[PDB]
Write a protein that binds this ligand. Structure first.
Ligand code: MMA
Ligand code: MMA
Ligand code: CA
Ligand code: CA
Ligand code: CA
Ligand code: CA
Ligand code: NA
Ligand code: NA
Lengths: 145, 145
């Protein structure tokens, strides 16, 4: 039963103490490995969703919290395998950022999006099979007090 | 700048991140050495006063944050040297606890009070010269949000 709260120039914005804060959102990085649907379930049970990246500044902050030997499920999927990628919170895909790696996405049967570290580019999105187990990242709104 | 907040079952009660929480107060243990007048001013510059002990449970909590080799100023003083001890917040001295060590207080000229660790009793209060330099303990109301 613990928040941490930072000053605002509302006078406080807050996140649970074991999460991470940036912008108008809290984040949680899960080091357990699950399929995509159960990764979404774990976030929901904390009152959040798989992460949605809305600007480059946001991603830049998330990647410094991650371990480079692991890949991380995002909230971006294509459930009919016809490259109609959707964000888990319905914000439009085409008008927003799309930080895919070089030569990705590239398979119709790889219907989930993950962020992963490849040299020489570093972090970027790769599409993968939704039924293989990986880490995840959640995001929810800040609490304002 | 940060606060830490605990559920209250007014829904949150908080304290600044580097302080300590118990009951309806936040506490700070200053490990610099000042005279009694400057120990008080230092607390005031943080929006606090030197500590007032109101029950024994409160004191049991504080001395577990303290270093047994050091003595600490209290918000309790006798300005005219006639044993009319008063609390810094004007709470009545008689209808309240009085954890003086055995054989204390004992000098009209020792007009400030401090908490100190004496074998065998352990922790308890002792009257001392205000113009000696010691550690101190600040207390302030909880911020509620
Ligand atoms: C080595 O990486 C390649 O193999 C994985 C299979 O998991 C693909 O998803 C990825 O896009 C690449 O083509
Ligand atoms: C170590 O304690 C003794 O000496 C201090 C002097 O500060 C007195 O206040 C106290 O009563 C004791 O006699
Ligand atoms: Ca976002
Ligand atoms: Ca792929
Ligand atoms: Ca008190
Ligand atoms: Ca004394
Ligand atoms: Na795909
Ligand atoms: Na005295």
């Amino acid at each position: 039963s613990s928040l941490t709260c930072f000053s605002e120039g509302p006078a406080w914005g807050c996140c649970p103490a074991s999460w991470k804060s940036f912008g108008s959102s809290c984040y949680f990085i899960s080091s357990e490995e699950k399929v995509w649907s159960k990764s979404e379930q774990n976030c929901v049970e904390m009152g959040a969703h798989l992460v949605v990246f809305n600007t480059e500044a946001e991603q830049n902050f998330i990647v410094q919290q991650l371990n480079e030997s692991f890949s991380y499920f995002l909230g971006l999927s294509d459930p009919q395998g016809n490259n109609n990628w959707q964000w888990i919170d319905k914000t439009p895909y085409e008008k927003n950022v799309r930080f895919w790696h070089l030569g990705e996405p590239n398979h119709s049967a790889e219907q989930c999006a993950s962020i992963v570290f490849w040299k020489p580019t570093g972090w970027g999105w790769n599409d993968v099979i939704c039924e293989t187990r990986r880490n995840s990242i959640c995001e929810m709104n800040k609490i304002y007090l």
